[PDB]
Amino acid sequence: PFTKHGQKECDNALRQLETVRELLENPVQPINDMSYFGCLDSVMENSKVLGEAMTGISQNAKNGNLPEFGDAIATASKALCGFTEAAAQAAYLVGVSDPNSQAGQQGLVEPTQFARANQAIQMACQSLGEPGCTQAQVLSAATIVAKHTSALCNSCRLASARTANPTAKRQFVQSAKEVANSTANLVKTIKALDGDFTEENRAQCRAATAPLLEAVDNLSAFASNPEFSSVPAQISPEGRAAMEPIVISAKTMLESAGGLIQTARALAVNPRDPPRWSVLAGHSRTVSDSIKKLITSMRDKAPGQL
């Protein structure tokens, strides 16, 4: 059961590495807010962390300290994800830096989290509309409503401030009021329901979901227009060539790190295995070499970002 805990951390790490790998597939948008030297500082610090973690991975697999082994694996996985985000961000910056490249444009609204809120509010309201809805369900649905309506109104305020489209500016403000007003009206019915859980107050609360659903639905429809969505960067062939050394080095790091974790997973179960210790050393060196090439590639281009 203790080794099973270590194996599970390995499987979690491997899952995260495959997820973060997608950042390197086609960097046509920024990953975060980091500048170029921000990315470089990030990779350097994650290098120190990863180096320490990889020492802990081997040492604790050998000595059979499975709790410390799992922690070293998780630490390594986090550093590798940090590496990849910085590398993918730096590669994007390099690609769009090219004179014949065009940078991406972030949308007025984060695309899916708007549908996420719409769905969460729809299903919260669905619960409030059910004849069998219990008092605890009113409370849980109310927390869902409050969380996502607050987010929706914040996104409306921000989207309105960013857009140059006058119609969109007014619509986002109008939708924010519609959501705020309908939500407040629903919260009013919920408070009355709490003080007196009558059939009238139950029907009143149920009825108050409809104006909220309509507002959130009209808003989701309007905000899903492609005009308001992000535009991917158009990176020139020269930009692609320039960013490729960073990309392939980060890709090679993730691949070799996967082998290292898979090998360590087996060694945690049975460390008495000289062949696998050699395989682990092979993966470790390839991880280290990949990082070296990544830092080298990024340092080569650093003077152009001073």
Binding site: A142, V145, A146, K147, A184, V187, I190, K191
Partner: peptide, 17 residues
Amino acid sequence: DSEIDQLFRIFRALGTP
């Protein structure tokens, strides 16, 4: 009107990580 805003803020706190 203000008790509703207070209740709403309680609801948001209970449903936010």
